[PDB]
């Protein structure tokens, strides 16, 4: 009952449940329909571009946070009307187009609803993404399904249980009529015999005008990535047409919270990334070391749904009747819900565990039960004491014995 | 089902599916429980008065935008706890009122919600005016229906699909003694033997406190309608109580993007119209020409409810799966609605086309497919090649070959 | 004295005290640095275009109201990285501009700080505009000084008590690489050679495509209202008058721009009701009639006691009392308000002061009975526009 | 010179430095056109009122902060436009005004610039007021003088270091003739015959409409007064027309920071005070016990006006190069400014220490230098020692040895 | 003269004026009494932190930007009232402070008005920053002077132009007893026998906690920005040069500062279209190359005329039309700009001034023939790096 959708009887961490195959890559999809993901008010999908490979431009009623989870990229996003500013010097022939942005593993990349984006894989390894949909957004005035209107290709569609792209629906010689070209351009347009699917081998390196890496970028991103196998180890112009849409929330000296032998926290909102005022999203990134716990709280204002980057945890999330409706290891590819409220608690087995978090609200944040920031804190010894029947000796070391905020050292 | 509301398969233009007659004008609904209707989450109706008539006294539960298709009139809101600022001279039995606004051809006027207003046709004419409702406003609190809460005359219901109006259901000595005033009155407020209906025949002029033409006045919105007419041939009180609620979007010179072979499209937001910030609604108004064409687009933010003022066009409206779920001409009179993020294309017949569009978003905004503000430009050459499986020089053409922005000429 | 700068010991309405001729128009200009345009941080301009008459384009470091006080003509203001929606149809030598205004007799427009417009006068008679400068406004970084720079042309500075645009202060050379043109374009430019000052001649007709994403929302807000126009009032009694005004609840950009206006139309012997401005100064314009206008300091002295005449301007300072009675042709003003939503406070009328204290507190202030109190209350019916 | 305002050299509290007597109470003022009170744009005066005493009524081109240091009244602010609700019963020349508020010992009371208000003695003891005037606010466009128009009686102007109110200036027939009054009518409002200067005895109880205090918002106060004395030993007119002024900030249950031995702080901003937002203003409120510590802090955002209202303190404020620049003990009645970003320390004397501040942000807020929220606490212990050239030891007692937050005990 | 000090007669790009030798590192300045700086509201100074350097921990009354030029370090700055949340583990004497931060090389970062940090260069290289004091900022209610309080060390002050710091100026024993400490550790904090002025050496191997509801938010809010990364450009043409632009859509903190900036770095030839800013004054710091500026005011006159130079600094006013070209090794600058979402108007390229005015109305500007406008309008096919 869409009255009572988040009356929730078990929950599970869930892998994908089916897979697109596509002449250069693979789109994963978890089910929407799950009793979960709809009290959330999230679809979610992974894909994987495997070298040279071109995920056709593609826009969506929902908004949208993209998690690289692996790899090195190009997007992709296009934003109505503004001009092109990346273009061939005079000194029409010469290519232009709007700015394009490196993606690479830990960015997370916002994409509003109706927006439409590609990406390329111009690196060696596969590019894998998390997409993460809002469908409960304001933003995302159609109904509850995500959807996927694509503007190139002739794609499967990722979310449905003479043409599949939206201009493949106009009649062919008003289509030439209003582009002002032929009749078997505007039938390439319409990708009615295009049998790549989604995500499209490119022969030959893609050019397009693009400003040079590094080299002192390359030796940046370079470091960064040795540092996470060492931690695996232990006018117009100006303003609105050149917003950030990425933020790099994986490295590990972007840690919000951190204790070394216990774990990082990285967090985004409106005040990392401004675009996320707009929509209204947040996000977190973790990377918590072996046996490491997320001190046990409830989120405030928001959903919390995790994809497990790496490794595994224990997990318990539990309902306003002390029921802790998930109850597991959650491992590696998998996505679970903790709704909004119900407290939850993780403890990492011994290799670790990563995760991205996508929060449904602005500014999202949590309310901890230990730690040197808790709940039990902000009580008078003597509310504790009686609340819970203990010495006020107890009650002190409820209080203080937990030294640290959120990630605590086991 | 309410998770799947904009599911929808076929999608039809078309006119009021019923009509009420009162004495003196008569009200069209189109049924809001039909498919699109509900997937928009708008209500639609059409007023006719005729001259001395009298609009009674209403407001609603949700937003409106009314369109004023042809005549002359005044229209008079009512803001709670302003104080009257039209007062007759005493150099009470004097006359004072809230500001009346002339209304006229081509001016929409924004309602808010629970906000009374009456309105009355002091023109030559009959007044034609479209009323479109946000009933899944966040300014509704109450369901997905829209109501009018009558405060004179016993109404028959719109919206339908001893006494009518709010006055009437209050016990009449207790509003007598409210009022302070006998009950023969405050029964001819609850007007149990009024038989007129919503729309009151005035007798001879209705005299109201009203600023003169004048005129000096009368010769500008002359000057207007031998245009209108060429081109389809060949403290408180001087701040929050005096806000705008109107603007003229149907004048030829006040439109945003005009091509003199293809036509003209002005845009009504919030950064003209300052309580569209507050309403949350955008609309449009366009004259396309003979056989111009409205570029392929998609609204990014918002549904368009497309009312048809005069001629014609040809209509798809493209869902996420390519399939056409609207391919018609559309016609003077009627009304179809394009959801959010659909693919939309638009050539006007021989005697050019043209519509009002009600936008449930502020600040709605498109992304075309066609021209120089088009997503086509906004993408490097090769990925257009990639894409679409065509050479660099079929790319270019795609890119450069439409020269205008959003209104094409044929 | 700065810290001083509104000690002002006494006002007068006046025309403009400066004048500058061009080809195909004037520049008449009033002196910035009168100590009453100094208090309000206001400069103030009247500029008159003759038939066919182009004002040629240039941006100021202020923001201004513009009013229209006759005739009609065409604005073309020009907003950074905006397309151009103006485009004559295909089938380059395609005349392609952004969107143009139509303004006209009573339309106020606003003008932010560094945004480039031109206007054009293609009617019958003269076009005739005031413009004011918030000059003290948070939108000008420079100085208190007013300043026009112009794009084309080679005018004569309206702000002072071979060529001077901006594009003449450039190498020649250099302009013309960046422009990709030759050296004899770059330099037509410059306006070295150019004599009409900043208001120049137009032969025959000027053609401009004219009607009968980022394009349909930033790039189209609206710089104009009608104020002028009898209907649009706010506040109207037949034997008094009518006062429309101009602020963020009507036109978004003043929101932005953080300026009010009002236009108001007082009848034989009208009264505009007295009052204070709350939150700003007004600088008020006569487009025709009289008044008698007597404005009050904090100490109880009229620093202006005066008729008002047809295109005198005078400045009532935030917080002065101010009383104005129409003389026998009654009353046209445009006023600029230097304050986002200025409202007032009157001290007559329905709406004052007076009727909000209880009545033995206005027997106690003014030592008068409990009925004097209730006739000052209650005798007056009508609002802020006030009947002889 | 304006351009270096702020290089004060000295220092000083000091006591106000002129009187004005008035039939029924006095004001006293402090001069603003000392360097400090120029340098932190503020100017300040006091002001009492005899039992039975009307402040008659006035506004300022500055908004202010009126701290009510004893006694109890009412005050009548009013706001332009909105309607009398205040009204004596029908059940047509009654008694009608626009609301009233009380007003005792503890309230801070909010004045917009431009807005008018009087003010009445009815309680037993004298009323006294500090009146602290914004005069670099934004709000203020005459210039940095104070100014206070008085509406009624002929005032002595107390900011100047034929009658002479606002009406006094206007043709007395003109005057007459806007008010429809008789001219001997409106030669009483200009009143140039008026002997008494701006607070004014009332003759018998002032009548207007008041609604009662009880019977228990008496015990309330009561029981507030008792608990500081024992301190001292150990439409429209629902919204914008209602807005709140005033908040009691200085009963002791009112606390943010409380710390037994040492004191209490409460605070005011726009979390606490709507209008303080507008304003862009706050105001402090402490109490300090014997020998109790203010941390040293310095001010962020803000200047802070100290008006001593009981005790006493030493007192420090050091300014960018180390020099302290106000050294004193500060007492009753004494005002000192602590400029923006000087340090500042403060030590309480044996009766304890009580002040109002004014600070001239909205929410203004301080860094300490010393407790649980310091900066020396933010600072990695390495850093500590390398910048002090101390002992790891030593640095982890800078930290850790003091455990309170604002408000130390000896 | 405040009332005029935007007049400016002349202009020049210099190096900075003053010295400030210290242990580990050295603080240089730009004389803030210049016409030029006064104008625009800004102080500058370059600090240079060398090997194992720690930048002692300071506050100034100006919100500021500062640029990495070159080099590797750690900032801590600090946040009012937010927890330390990089604390050691247990299993109290560990240690535990407020979030470090890494800045490199490109890294724009933004320290609010009264808000104090430290610097510590732990890199090969010395660490090399520009740091721009917006002193006419609302967020200074001091005066026009850029003042820096220090919180440790006897600095010798470097905007002058028991020792000296905040806890210097405190009673000893008061201030002990504050910190509940012995009067020979608080002794220490006011720092009278500091020999080392603001930069200090490390000593070690300066170690602390580092990764290899409001914590989450207020707390952990963004500083900084790359935008010296040449993959972050905005615009970009490759024979022309690229653009990064700094403001509120990117970095949510500069909506409070009401600040911007900008990096760019000109190719050979390569001319920045002539362009003014509309809303701001820029500050531009050569980092690297050379470039022809010309500066232009209302009158028409080029102000600053110059061959501006690795390490100069040169200021364009808001409103005032400017032309760069890149020399024969390129030009690299960044760019503070003195207002929220500071923008250009370019009287060159696809998005200029020209494009926007109908063709006709060029032609009798300018004129020139219908087709020499058009020849303006659309020979140079870039918008903002124009190719030459
Ligand atoms: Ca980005
Ligand atoms: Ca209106
Ligand atoms: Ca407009
Ligand atoms: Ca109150
Ligand atoms: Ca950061
Ligand atoms: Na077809
Ligand atoms: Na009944
Ligand atoms: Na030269
Ligand atoms: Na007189
Ligand atoms: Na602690
Ligand atoms: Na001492
Ligand atoms: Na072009």
Redesign the interface.
């Given at each position: 009952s869409?009255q009572n959708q988040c009356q929730l009887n078990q929950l599970q961490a869930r892998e994908p449940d089916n897979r697109i195959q596509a002449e250069a890559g693979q789109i994963e999809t978890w089910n929407f329909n799950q009793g979960d993901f709809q009290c959330a008010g999230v679809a979610a999908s992974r894909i994987t571009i495997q070298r040279n490979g071109?995920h056709?431009?593609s826009?969506?009623?929902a908004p949208q946070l993209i998690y690289i989870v692996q790899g090195r990229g190009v997007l992709g996003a296009?934003?109505?009307?503004?001009?092109?500013?990346?273009?061939?010097?005079?000194?029409?022939?010469?290519?232009?187009?709007?700015?394009?942005?490196?993606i690479r593993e830990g960015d997370v990349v916002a994409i509003p609803?109706?927006?439409?984006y590609?990406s390329?894989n111009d690196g060696d390894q596969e590019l894998v993404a998390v997409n993460l949909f809002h469908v409960s957004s304001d933003?995302?005035?159609?109904?509850?399904?995500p959807?996927?209107?694509?503007?190139?290709?002739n794609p499967e569609?990722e979310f449905?249980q003479?043409?599949?792209?939206?201009?493949?629906?106009?009649?062919t010689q008003?289509?030439a009529?209003?582009?002002?070209?032929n009749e078997e351009?505007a039938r390439?347009?319409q990708?009615q015999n295009?049998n790549r699917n989604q995500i499209?081998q490119?022969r030959g390196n893609?050019?397009?005008?693009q400003?040079?890496?590094?080299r002192?970028?390359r030796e940046?991103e370079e470091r960064q990535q040795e540092?996470l196998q060492?931690?695996r180890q232990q006018?117009?112009?100006?303003?609105?047409?050149?917003?950030?849409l990425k933020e790099n929330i994986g490295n590990?000296?972007?840690?919000?919270?951190?204790?070394?032998?216990?774990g990082?926290?990285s967090?985004l909102?409106?005040?990392?990334?401004?675009?996320l005022?707009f929509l209204r999203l947040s996000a977190?990134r973790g990377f918590f070391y072996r046996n490491g716990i997320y001190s046990p709280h409830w989120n405030?204002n928001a959903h919390s749904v995790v994809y497990v980057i790496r490794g595994n945890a224990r997990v318990q999330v539990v309902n306003e009747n002390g029921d802790a409706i998930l109850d597991q290891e959650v491992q590696q590819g998998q996505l679970f819900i903790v709704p909004q409220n119900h407290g939850v608690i993780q403890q990492a087995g011994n290799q670790g565990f990563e995760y991205f978090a996508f929060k449904t609200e602005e500014?999202a944040?949590?309310?901890t039960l230990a730690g040197?920031?808790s709940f039990l804190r902000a009580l008078p010894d003597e509310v504790l004491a009686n609340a819970y029947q203990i010495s006020r000796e107890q009650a002190r070391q409820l209080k203080y014995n937990?030294?640290?905020?959120?990630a605590l050292?086991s």
């Open positions: 869409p071109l056709l431009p826009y969506s009623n296009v934003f109505s009307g503004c001009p092109e500013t990346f273009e061939e010097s005079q000194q029409r022939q010469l290519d232009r187009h709007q700015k394009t942005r490196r609803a109706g927006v439409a590609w390329y933003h995302n005035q159609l109904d509850q399904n959807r996927k209107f694509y503007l190139a290709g569609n449905n003479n043409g599949n792209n939206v201009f493949s629906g106009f009649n008003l289509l009529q209003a582009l002002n070209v351009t390439n347009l990708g295009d499209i490119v893609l050019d397009f005008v400003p040079p890496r590094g002192q970028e940046h540092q060492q931690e006018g117009l112009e100006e303003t609105f047409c050149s917003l950030r590990p000296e972007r840690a919000d919270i951190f204790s070394p032998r216990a990082r926290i967090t909102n409106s005040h990392n990334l401004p675009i005022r977190e405030v500014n944040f949590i309310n040197r920031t937990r030294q640290e905020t959120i050292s």
